[PDB]
Design an enzyme around this catalytic site. Structure first.
Site, PDB file in Angstrom:
ATOM      1  N   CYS A 183       0.805  -1.219   0.000  1.00  0.00           N
ATOM      2  CA  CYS A 183       0.000   0.000   0.000  1.00  0.00           C
ATOM      3  C   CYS A 183       0.835   1.264   0.000  1.00  0.00           C
ATOM      4  N   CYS A 203     -10.999  12.601 -21.946  1.00  0.00           N
ATOM      5  CA  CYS A 203     -11.141  12.956 -23.361  1.00  0.00           C
ATOM      6  C   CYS A 203     -12.445  12.468 -23.973  1.00  0.00           C
ATOM      7  N   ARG A 229     -13.069  31.413 -40.927  1.00  0.00           N
ATOM      8  CA  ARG A 229     -13.780  32.359 -41.784  1.00  0.00           C
ATOM      9  C   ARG A 229     -13.044  33.694 -41.817  1.00  0.00           C
ATOM     10  N   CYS A 236       2.871   7.693  -8.797  1.00  0.00           N
ATOM     11  CA  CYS A 236       2.713   7.120 -10.133  1.00  0.00           C
ATOM     12  C   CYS A 236       3.879   7.615 -11.003  1.00  0.00           C
ATOM     13  N   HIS A 287      -3.924  18.625 -25.989  1.00  0.00           N
ATOM     14  CA  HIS A 287      -3.896  20.090 -25.995  1.00  0.00           C
ATOM     15  C   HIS A 287      -4.144  20.674 -24.610  1.00  0.00           C
ATOM     16  N   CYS A 332      -7.727  10.581 -14.865  1.00  0.00           N
ATOM     17  CA  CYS A 332      -8.289   9.492 -15.628  1.00  0.00           C
ATOM     18  C   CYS A 332      -8.128   8.113 -14.994  1.00  0.00           C
ATOM     19  N   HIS A 333      -7.058   7.898 -14.251  1.00  0.00           N
ATOM     20  CA  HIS A 333      -6.741   6.609 -13.653  1.00  0.00           C
ATOM     21  C   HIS A 333      -7.034   6.608 -12.147  1.00  0.00           C
ATOM     22  N   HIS A 368     -22.492  28.913 -31.214  1.00  0.00           N
ATOM     23  CA  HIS A 368     -21.411  29.080 -32.193  1.00  0.00           C
ATOM     24  C   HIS A 368     -21.936  28.549 -33.535  1.00  0.00           C
ATOM     25  N   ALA A 410      -7.748   4.433  -8.537  1.00  0.00           N
ATOM     26  CA  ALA A 410      -7.065   3.199  -8.129  1.00  0.00           C
ATOM     27  C   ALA A 410      -8.026   2.114  -7.682  1.00  0.00           C
ATOM     28  N   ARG A 454     -22.901  36.104 -34.826  1.00  0.00           N
ATOM     29  CA  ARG A 454     -23.169  34.677 -34.691  1.00  0.00           C
ATOM     30  C   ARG A 454     -24.652  34.341 -34.677  1.00  0.00           C
ATOM     31  N   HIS A 512      -1.918  10.771 -23.618  1.00  0.00           N
ATOM     32  CA  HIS A 512      -0.985  11.366 -22.667  1.00  0.00           C
ATOM     33  C   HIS A 512      -0.246  12.562 -23.246  1.00  0.00           C
ATOM     34  N   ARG A 553     -22.640  37.980 -28.161  1.00  0.00           N
ATOM     35  CA  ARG A 553     -21.239  38.263 -27.933  1.00  0.00           C
ATOM     36  C   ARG A 553     -20.390  38.194 -29.198  1.00  0.00           C
ATOM     37  N   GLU A 557     -14.044  30.387 -35.742  1.00  0.00           N
ATOM     38  CA  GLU A 557     -14.502  31.498 -36.561  1.00  0.00           C
ATOM     39  C   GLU A 557     -13.317  32.125 -37.283  1.00  0.00           C
ATOM     40  N   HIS A 605     -22.732  27.508 -27.095  1.00  0.00           N
ATOM     41  CA  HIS A 605     -21.328  27.851 -26.858  1.00  0.00           C
ATOM     42  C   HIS A 605     -21.035  28.703 -25.640  1.00  0.00           C
ATOM     43  N   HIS A 606     -21.875  29.719 -25.403  1.00  0.00           N
ATOM     44  CA  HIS A 606     -21.575  30.741 -24.397  1.00  0.00           C
ATOM     45  C   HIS A 606     -22.833  31.338 -23.785  1.00  0.00           C
TER      46      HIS A 606
HETATM   47  C1  LIG Z   1     -14.282  25.641 -27.545  1.00  0.00           C
HETATM   48  C2  LIG Z   1     -14.258  27.094 -27.127  1.00  0.00           C
HETATM   49  C3  LIG Z   1     -13.493  28.048 -27.794  1.00  0.00           C
HETATM   50  C4  LIG Z   1     -13.554  29.442 -27.433  1.00  0.00           C
HETATM   51  N1  LIG Z   1     -12.674  30.318 -28.024  1.00  0.00           N
HETATM   52  C5  LIG Z   1     -12.794  31.572 -27.709  1.00  0.00           C
HETATM   53  C6  LIG Z   1     -11.816  32.530 -28.305  1.00  0.00           C
HETATM   54  O1  LIG Z   1     -11.015  32.184 -29.107  1.00  0.00           O
HETATM   55  N2  LIG Z   1     -12.035  33.855 -27.903  1.00  0.00           N
HETATM   56  C7  LIG Z   1     -13.015  34.254 -26.991  1.00  0.00           C
HETATM   57  O2  LIG Z   1     -13.062  35.464 -26.755  1.00  0.00           O
HETATM   58  N3  LIG Z   1     -13.836  33.354 -26.370  1.00  0.00           N
HETATM   59  C8  LIG Z   1     -13.686  32.100 -26.723  1.00  0.00           C
HETATM   60  N4  LIG Z   1     -14.517  31.196 -26.106  1.00  0.00           N
HETATM   61  C9  LIG Z   1     -15.185  31.586 -24.813  1.00  0.00           C
HETATM   62  C10 LIG Z   1     -14.203  31.668 -23.719  1.00  0.00           C
HETATM   63  O3  LIG Z   1     -13.173  30.654 -23.739  1.00  0.00           O
HETATM   64  C11 LIG Z   1     -15.005  31.356 -22.363  1.00  0.00           C
HETATM   65  O4  LIG Z   1     -16.034  32.362 -22.286  1.00  0.00           O
HETATM   66  C12 LIG Z   1     -14.079  31.442 -21.132  1.00  0.00           C
HETATM   67  O5  LIG Z   1     -13.668  30.033 -20.973  1.00  0.00           O
HETATM   68  C13 LIG Z   1     -14.834  31.966 -19.890  1.00  0.00           C
HETATM   69  O6  LIG Z   1     -13.673  31.874 -19.072  1.00  0.00           O
HETATM   70  P1  LIG Z   1     -13.971  31.874 -17.496  1.00  0.00           P
HETATM   71  O7  LIG Z   1     -12.663  32.032 -16.805  1.00  0.00           O
HETATM   72  O8  LIG Z   1     -15.062  32.778 -17.187  1.00  0.00           O
HETATM   73  O9  LIG Z   1     -14.461  30.372 -17.301  1.00  0.00           O
HETATM   74  P2  LIG Z   1     -13.864  28.932 -17.626  1.00  0.00           P
HETATM   75  O10 LIG Z   1     -12.607  29.116 -18.402  1.00  0.00           O
HETATM   76  O11 LIG Z   1     -14.917  28.034 -18.080  1.00  0.00           O
HETATM   77  O12 LIG Z   1     -13.356  28.444 -16.183  1.00  0.00           O
HETATM   78  C14 LIG Z   1     -14.284  28.280 -15.090  1.00  0.00           C
HETATM   79  C15 LIG Z   1     -13.757  27.128 -14.243  1.00  0.00           C
HETATM   80  O13 LIG Z   1     -14.555  27.145 -13.045  1.00  0.00           O
HETATM   81  C16 LIG Z   1     -14.758  25.821 -12.630  1.00  0.00           C
HETATM   82  N5  LIG Z   1     -15.917  25.825 -11.750  1.00  0.00           N
HETATM   83  C17 LIG Z   1     -17.258  26.014 -12.012  1.00  0.00           C
HETATM   84  N6  LIG Z   1     -18.022  25.971 -10.934  1.00  0.00           N
HETATM   85  C18 LIG Z   1     -17.138  25.623  -9.922  1.00  0.00           C
HETATM   86  C19 LIG Z   1     -17.286  25.526  -8.538  1.00  0.00           C
HETATM   87  N7  LIG Z   1     -18.479  25.620  -7.948  1.00  0.00           N
HETATM   88  N8  LIG Z   1     -16.208  25.255  -7.778  1.00  0.00           N
HETATM   89  C20 LIG Z   1     -14.996  25.169  -8.379  1.00  0.00           C
HETATM   90  N9  LIG Z   1     -14.740  25.296  -9.693  1.00  0.00           N
HETATM   91  C21 LIG Z   1     -15.842  25.698 -10.373  1.00  0.00           C
HETATM   92  C22 LIG Z   1     -15.049  25.127 -14.000  1.00  0.00           C
HETATM   93  O14 LIG Z   1     -14.885  23.727 -13.891  1.00  0.00           O
HETATM   94  C23 LIG Z   1     -13.922  25.745 -14.852  1.00  0.00           C
HETATM   95  O15 LIG Z   1     -12.737  24.997 -14.916  1.00  0.00           O
HETATM   96  C24 LIG Z   1     -14.388  29.861 -26.375  1.00  0.00           C
HETATM   97  C25 LIG Z   1     -15.170  28.908 -25.672  1.00  0.00           C
HETATM   98  C26 LIG Z   1     -15.052  27.520 -26.012  1.00  0.00           C
HETATM   99  C27 LIG Z   1     -15.897  26.518 -25.258  1.00  0.00           C
HETATM  100  C1  HEC Z   2      -1.643   3.061  -6.079  1.00  0.00           C
HETATM  101  C2  HEC Z   2      -1.534   2.359  -7.357  1.00  0.00           C
HETATM  102  C3  HEC Z   2      -2.517   2.582  -5.099  1.00  0.00           C
HETATM  103  C4  HEC Z   2      -2.372   1.408  -4.433  1.00  0.00           C
HETATM  104  C5  HEC Z   2      -1.606   0.173  -4.891  1.00  0.00           C
HETATM  105  C6  HEC Z   2      -3.291   1.454  -3.312  1.00  0.00           C
HETATM  106  N1  HEC Z   2      -4.004   2.639  -3.287  1.00  0.00           N
HETATM  107 FE1  HEC Z   2      -5.380   3.281  -2.005  1.00  0.00          FE
HETATM  108  N2  HEC Z   2      -5.713   4.849  -3.021  1.00  0.00           N
HETATM  109  C7  HEC Z   2      -5.003   5.299  -4.117  1.00  0.00           C
HETATM  110  C8  HEC Z   2      -5.580   6.511  -4.647  1.00  0.00           C
HETATM  111  C9  HEC Z   2      -5.057   7.357  -5.805  1.00  0.00           C
HETATM  112  C10 HEC Z   2      -6.659   6.812  -3.880  1.00  0.00           C
HETATM  113  C11 HEC Z   2      -7.735   7.844  -4.239  1.00  0.00           C
HETATM  114  C12 HEC Z   2      -9.067   7.219  -4.694  1.00  0.00           C
HETATM  115  C13 HEC Z   2      -8.879   6.280  -5.872  1.00  0.00           C
HETATM  116  O1  HEC Z   2      -9.389   5.145  -5.851  1.00  0.00           O
HETATM  117  O2  HEC Z   2      -8.202   6.689  -6.838  1.00  0.00           O
HETATM  118  C14 HEC Z   2      -6.742   5.751  -2.886  1.00  0.00           C
HETATM  119  C15 HEC Z   2      -7.632   5.718  -1.837  1.00  0.00           C
HETATM  120  C16 HEC Z   2      -7.718   4.691  -0.908  1.00  0.00           C
HETATM  121  C17 HEC Z   2      -8.550   4.813   0.274  1.00  0.00           C
HETATM  122  C18 HEC Z   2      -9.552   5.940   0.521  1.00  0.00           C
HETATM  123  C19 HEC Z   2      -9.114   6.943   1.600  1.00  0.00           C
HETATM  124  C20 HEC Z   2     -10.184   8.014   1.754  1.00  0.00           C
HETATM  125  O3  HEC Z   2     -11.143   7.967   0.957  1.00  0.00           O
HETATM  126  O4  HEC Z   2     -10.014   8.850   2.663  1.00  0.00           O
HETATM  127  C21 HEC Z   2      -8.149   3.842   1.142  1.00  0.00           C
HETATM  128  C22 HEC Z   2      -8.994   3.364   2.328  1.00  0.00           C
HETATM  129  C23 HEC Z   2      -7.084   3.127   0.473  1.00  0.00           C
HETATM  130  N3  HEC Z   2      -6.819   3.659  -0.780  1.00  0.00           N
HETATM  131  C24 HEC Z   2      -6.325   2.128   1.028  1.00  0.00           C
HETATM  132  C25 HEC Z   2      -5.364   1.382   0.388  1.00  0.00           C
HETATM  133  C26 HEC Z   2      -4.756   0.186   0.944  1.00  0.00           C
HETATM  134  C27 HEC Z   2      -5.099  -0.367   2.321  1.00  0.00           C
HETATM  135  C28 HEC Z   2      -3.942  -0.327  -0.012  1.00  0.00           C
HETATM  136  C29 HEC Z   2      -3.198  -1.504   0.070  1.00  0.00           C
HETATM  137  C30 HEC Z   2      -3.850  -2.814   0.092  1.00  0.00           C
HETATM  138  C31 HEC Z   2      -4.038   0.577  -1.147  1.00  0.00           C
HETATM  139  N4  HEC Z   2      -4.943   1.589  -0.903  1.00  0.00           N
HETATM  140  C32 HEC Z   2      -3.322   0.489  -2.322  1.00  0.00           C
HETATM  141  C33 HEC Z   2      -3.982   4.597  -4.716  1.00  0.00           C
HETATM  142  C34 HEC Z   2      -3.528   3.341  -4.379  1.00  0.00           C
HETATM  143  O1  LIG Z   3     -14.440  30.816 -33.031  1.00  0.00           O
HETATM  144  C1  LIG Z   3     -13.621  30.939 -32.142  1.00  0.00           C
HETATM  145  O2  LIG Z   3     -12.477  30.670 -32.060  1.00  0.00           O
HETATM  146  C2  LIG Z   3     -14.385  31.233 -30.766  1.00  0.00           C
HETATM  147  O3  LIG Z   3     -15.282  30.327 -30.431  1.00  0.00           O
HETATM  148  C3  LIG Z   3     -14.288  32.574 -30.475  1.00  0.00           C
HETATM  149  C4  LIG Z   3     -15.104  33.116 -29.519  1.00  0.00           C
HETATM  150  O4  LIG Z   3     -15.053  34.284 -28.901  1.00  0.00           O
HETATM  151  O5  LIG Z   3     -16.069  32.264 -28.775  1.00  0.00           O
HETATM  152 NA    NA Z   4     -22.231  35.374 -18.833  1.00  0.00          NA
END
Ligand SMILES: Cc1cc2nc3c(=O)[nH]c(=O)nc-3n(C[C@H](O)[C@H](O)[C@H](O)COP(=O)(O)OP(=O)(O)OC[C@H]3O[C@@H](n4cnc5c(N)ncnc54)[C@H](O)[C@@H]3O)c2cc1C
Ligand code: HEC
Ligand SMILES: O=C([O-])[C@H](O)C=C([O-])O
Ligand code: NA
Ligand code: HEC
Ligand code: HEC
Ligand code: HEC
EC number: 1.3.2.4
Length: 568
Positions: free
Chosen positions: A14, A82, A381, A36, A61, A71-72, A365, A74, A402, A58, A544, A378, A504-505
């Site tokens: 562990c 993605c 264009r 990891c 952009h 993504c991974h 959009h 445990a 738009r 891995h 916008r 855009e 889009h927005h």
């Molecule tokens: C594909 C795409 C292309 C665009 N390209 C353009 C461009 O070229 N030019 C342009 O002017 N505009 C563009 N826009 C619009 C512009 O990117 C967005 O309006 C901008 O992302 C707004 O930025 P923001 O910081 O307000 O929010 P975001 O960048 O969306 O960031 C907000 C973050 O807050 C997090 N969040 C939300 N609620 C919670 C919470 N309760 N607790 C914690 N985290 C929270 C979200 O997960 C997110 O990561 C594009 C939009 C998209 C989707």
């Molecule tokens: C790495 C490859 C891991 C190994 C091997 C073990 N654990 Fe783990 N554990 C790991 C992660 C990244 C996390 C976060 C949640 C997830 O599943 O990704 C955890 C979490 C646990 C928890 C939860 C703790 C909490 O929620 O507060 C416990 C109870 C736990 N792991 C225990 C544990 C034990 C006893 C292991 C050995 C048998 C063990 N883990 C291996 C990553 C990894």
């Molecule tokens: O077309 C773009 O790249 C884009 O989507 C731009 C804005 O502002 O939202």
């Molecule tokens: Na807004």
């Protein structure tokens, strides 16, 4: 084995992954991810082992350093992030189908019942300012406040940084910049204000737009000083001149700007916490904020004591259910957004007494790739592409606003159209090579072959382009009055991208004043509460302009951070 941990403990202890005591280090899972990497190498080193010709889980952009646990997981099967916008052929071990079902702020009232106990506890941290959301507005505010003497904590509910901002392509609007001057462009903050007000149907708050136009150059200057390349300046719809700034060659502005903000954040040792969701703004007995309680995905609920909270949570364009209640014409549309863009921050704002405004104004959009289900910029264009329908005809001024472009495309046969361009346009905007690598820009050495390939009347297509090229040389589009005719489509091969509008927005959001202070329905400021970026309403009116949202989030993010710090 049925999960990743079970796999590894076949031959590991562990503590190969965990801390000695076994407690998770923090909601970013810093230590664990560190483990990891200790065995597998950095994300780039892993990437060397998983390449495909046109994609790599891995090496994407996404900017910043993306944690393996994004993504991974445990101890349970996990999802490939993605898959929330693409369907690549992946074989991630212990994977499950992508499915996002984050509880609403209202549903989290099922945790009274965890929340009351947290609020009864000491605050886990006591700082000056807490910024919610790691998009452009949020990093800008975090950095700005830090440079102004405040201690900040920045939180992000997703496993990765950047929100929608990391996705931005076409650029960042500003006037009248050193960068435009180097490109021989003549512009003014007044012209930008006027384009913007008109583009929004004069619905926009003129004081907010004045802040957008007048601070825009400074915002480009600030990002540049932090290391950004905003030297390419392109045209977007509804603008009188080229003013959308982006990296050299026409690369996307988005991942670049967020990377730069991230680097600068790390440089200042800013406390950034992932998988940490802002849940409810806390106010003292006189109604000023006193902190925020958050929900860590791995460590549960806790609160942070602070004089100010800056909500920088983005829009709700991914939430079609909420969108369709506000604008039913967008029901069932695909969205361009990241999976977390569903408007929970707005709920947080409203619960703290902030009023909302302009919410019914939601932007589609005009060109989502039909084949890829992702936004096609855009700038395609702006840099010279045209639109044709299945009849092989032009049907619209491709650089109009738009609202009008979207309606035009939806009125064509099949409710989609085709971007058409050549290698001169392709070479002028390197972001187009990304669409080619995605496989959504089929190509051929003649318009007749292309049209036969894509179901466009080939002979009509040919004559349309020949005719369009003649208007370009004549300098006047007498067919659709497109005001800017930058390139003839006559170099090399031809490309087609099938496109249709995507949601889009969200132009509406929390009501703020020019200091980014959040206001209640009586138009009274809520002391300590700020809003910046797409979460706010009033900046962009009923439509916008492309390029104006990145301008907004830097300008208002920075402004909020400094106001917050001063409020202190
Ligand atoms: C594909 C795409 C292309 C665009 N390209 C353009 C461009 O070229 N030019 C342009 O002017 N505009 C563009 N826009 C619009 C512009 O990117 C967005 O309006 C901008 O992302 C707004 O930025 P923001 O910081 O307000 O929010 P975001 O960048 O969306 O960031 C907000 C973050 O807050 C997090 N969040 C939300 N609620 C919670 C919470 N309760 N607790 C914690 N985290 C929270 C979200 O997960 C997110 O990561 C594009 C939009 C998209 C989707
Ligand atoms: C790495 C490859 C891991 C190994 C091997 C073990 N654990 Fe783990 N554990 C790991 C992660 C990244 C996390 C976060 C949640 C997830 O599943 O990704 C955890 C979490 C646990 C928890 C939860 C703790 C909490 O929620 O507060 C416990 C109870 C736990 N792991 C225990 C544990 C034990 C006893 C292991 C050995 C048998 C063990 N883990 C291996 C990553 C990894
Ligand atoms: O077309 C773009 O790249 C884009 O989507 C731009 C804005 O502002 O939202
Ligand atoms: Na807004
Ligand atoms: C070293 C002590 C390791 C730690 C910590 C983690 N991994 Fe690992 N992993 C390790 C080995 C030696 C192997 C076997 C293959 C090899 O490289 O020799 C693995 C295997 C995996 C796999 C594949 C599992 C399968 O079913 O085939 C993955 C996807 C993987 N490991 C992921 C991963 C992550 C994300 C880690 C931290 C949470 C992690 N590993 C830790 C060695 C080590
Ligand atoms: C999602 C965006 C991911 C992140 C973040 C990380 N990994 Fe990953 N991993 C992912 C996928 C979809 C796959 C399959 C690749 C494919 O092309 O099909 C994987 C695979 C692995 C494996 C197996 C590689 C092999 O030997 O064939 C390993 C060892 C692995 N991933 C490790 C790993 C580590 C340690 C991460 C952080 C540095 C990490 N991955 C990030 C998707 C995602
Ligand atoms: C939706 C919000 C997205 C998520 C999540 C991911 N990507 Fe993406 N991807 C996005 C867009 C809008 C585009 C179009 C081109 C552009 O730069 O805007 C793409 C395209 C790609 C491509 C093709 C171009 C390239 O960079 O090679 C690839 C191979 C790709 N995306 C991979 C990728 C991976 C591996 C992701 C997970 C980490 C990822 N994308 C998520 C939108 C979205």
């Amino acid at each position: 084995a049925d999960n990743l941990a079970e796999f590894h403990v076949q031959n590991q202890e562990c503590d190969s992954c965990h801390t000695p005591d076994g407690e998770l280090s923090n909601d970013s899972l810093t230590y664990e991810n560190t483990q990891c990497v200790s065995c597998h190498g950095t994300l780039a080193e892993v990437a060397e082992t998983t390449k495909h010709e046109h994609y790599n889980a891995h090496a994407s952009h996404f900017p910043g350093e993306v944690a393996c646990t994004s993504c991974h997981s445990a101890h349970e099967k996990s999802m490939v992030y993605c898959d929330s916008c693409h369907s690549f052929d992946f074989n991630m071990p212990y994977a499950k189908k992508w499915l996002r079902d984050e509880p609403t702020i209202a549903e989290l009232a099922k945790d009274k019942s965890e929340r009351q106990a947290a609020l009864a506890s000491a605050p886990h941290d006591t700082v000056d300012v807490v910024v919610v959301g790691s998009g452009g507005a949020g990093f800008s505010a975090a950095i700005s406040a830090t440079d102004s003497g405040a201690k900040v904590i920045l939180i992000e509910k997703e496993p990765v940084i950047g929100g929608n901002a990391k996705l931005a392509a076409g650029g960042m609007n500003a006037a009248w910049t050193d960068q435009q001057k180097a490109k021989k462009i003549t512009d003014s903050p007044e012209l930008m204000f006027e384009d913007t007000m008109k583009g929004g149907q004069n619905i926009n708050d003129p004081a907010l737009v004045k802040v957008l136009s007048s601070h825009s150059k400074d915002s480009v200057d600030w990002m540049t000083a932090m290391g950004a390349d905003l030297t390419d300046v392109g045209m977007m719809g509804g603008a009188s001149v080229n003013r959308a700034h982006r990296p050299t060659g026409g690369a996307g502005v988005g991942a670049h700007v967020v990377q730069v903000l991230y680097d600068n954040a790390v440089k200042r040792n800013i406390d950034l916490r992932m998988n940490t969701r802002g849940i409810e703004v806390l106010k003292d007995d006189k109604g000023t904020v006193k902190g925020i309680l958050v929900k860590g995905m791995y460590k549960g609920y806790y609160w942070v004591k602070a004089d100010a909270v800056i909500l920088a949570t983005g829009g709700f364009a991914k939430n079609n259910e909420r969108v369709a209640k506000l604008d039913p014409s967008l029901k069932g549309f695909i969205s361009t957004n990241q999976p977390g863009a569903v408007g929970d921050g707005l709920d947080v704002a409203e619960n703290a007494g902030g009023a909302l405004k302009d919410m019914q104004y939601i932007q589609a959009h005009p060109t989502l790739s039909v084949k890829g289900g992702v936004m096609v910029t855009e700038a395609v264009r702006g840099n010279g592409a045209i639109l044709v329908n299945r009849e092989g005809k032009r049907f619209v001024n491709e650089i109009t606003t738009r609202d009008k472009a979207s309606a035009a495309i939806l009125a064509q046969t099949g409710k989609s159209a085709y971007l058409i361009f050549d290698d001169s346009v392709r070479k002028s905007l390197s972001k187009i090579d990304k669409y080619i690598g995605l496989g959504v820009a089929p190509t051929a050495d003649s318009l007749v072959k292309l049209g036969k390939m894509e179901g466009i009347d080939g002979k009509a297509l040919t004559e349309t382009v020949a005719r369009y090229n003649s208007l370009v040389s004549s300098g006047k589009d007498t067919d659709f009055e497109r005001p800017n005719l930058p390139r003839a489509l006559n170099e090399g091969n031809y490309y087609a991208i099938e496109v249709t509008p995507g949601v889009h927005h969200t132009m509406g959001g929390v009501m703020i004043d020019t200091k980014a202070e959040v206001m209640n329905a009586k138009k009274q400021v809520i002391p300590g509460l700020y809003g910046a970026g797409e979460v706010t309403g009033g900046v962009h009116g009923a439509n916008r302009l492309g390029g104006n949202a990145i301008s907004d989030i830097i300008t208002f993010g920075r402004l909020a951070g400094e106001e917050a710090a001063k409020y202190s």
